[PDB]
Symmetry: C4
């Protein structure tokens, strides 16, 4: 009765992993499918500053003052 209990639990351990392996794979396929943070942050920061480096050179506030200056 001893050996069978060991046989049962051993079979269960070995089975148990295969769904554990499926999960570890999913975590590695998930980590290696996203972009790095520093590359992502540069690209969006560079977009914020570009969009604003343009509107500030746009000089929206020049009009009304040039209206009064004629």
């Amino acid at each position: 009765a001893n050996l069978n209990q060991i046989q049962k639990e051993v079979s269960e351990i070995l089975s148990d992993q295969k769904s554990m392996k499926a999960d570890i794979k999913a975590i590695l396929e998930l980590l290696g499918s996203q972009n790095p943070i520093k590359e992502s942050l540069e690209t969006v920061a560079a977009k914020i500053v570009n969009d604003l480096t343009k509107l500030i050179n746009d000089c929206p506030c020049n009009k009304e003052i040039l209206e009064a200056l004629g």
Copy 2:
């Protein structure tokens, strides 16, 4: 040395692995909950640029200058 000890050992492995399976599941259900960084950035970066666009297009500094020019803003 003996089958009795092996049995405790085997049971202990089994138990701990069960715990580990659940703990691994959690890691996955928590890297999975974390939604795209590349999508979260774009939405916030739009909100930053929108706000500061509203401010600039308000021309806060014209009031002082139009005052000197004798014209209402």
Copy 3:
């Protein structure tokens, strides 16, 4: 034959041990940081507030008022 089974089984255990410690480390790392949406909001707010303060503080106006004839 129970010697070899005992040696393997101890080595399975000893490894689960180190495995355990790593999952713990992974769960601590992930579990201990602000949601991505939360951390991006405080930074964004930081930026706007840092830039509003400068803009509202009207830096370029004195050069104009000087040229206009004021001071």
Copy 4:
């Protein structure tokens, strides 16, 4: 029964060695990276500093002073 068990045990041990190495690597990866809140502070300060460069420069004064 016994040789059966000795084989599943070898199989558990070997299959686990690969799991433990992948787990170590998951950790390796979440280490290679510096905290998200830590990298956002740095990229934020350059965003403001360089628009600070732009605004303090007064790109909109040239057109006003030309009328004065």
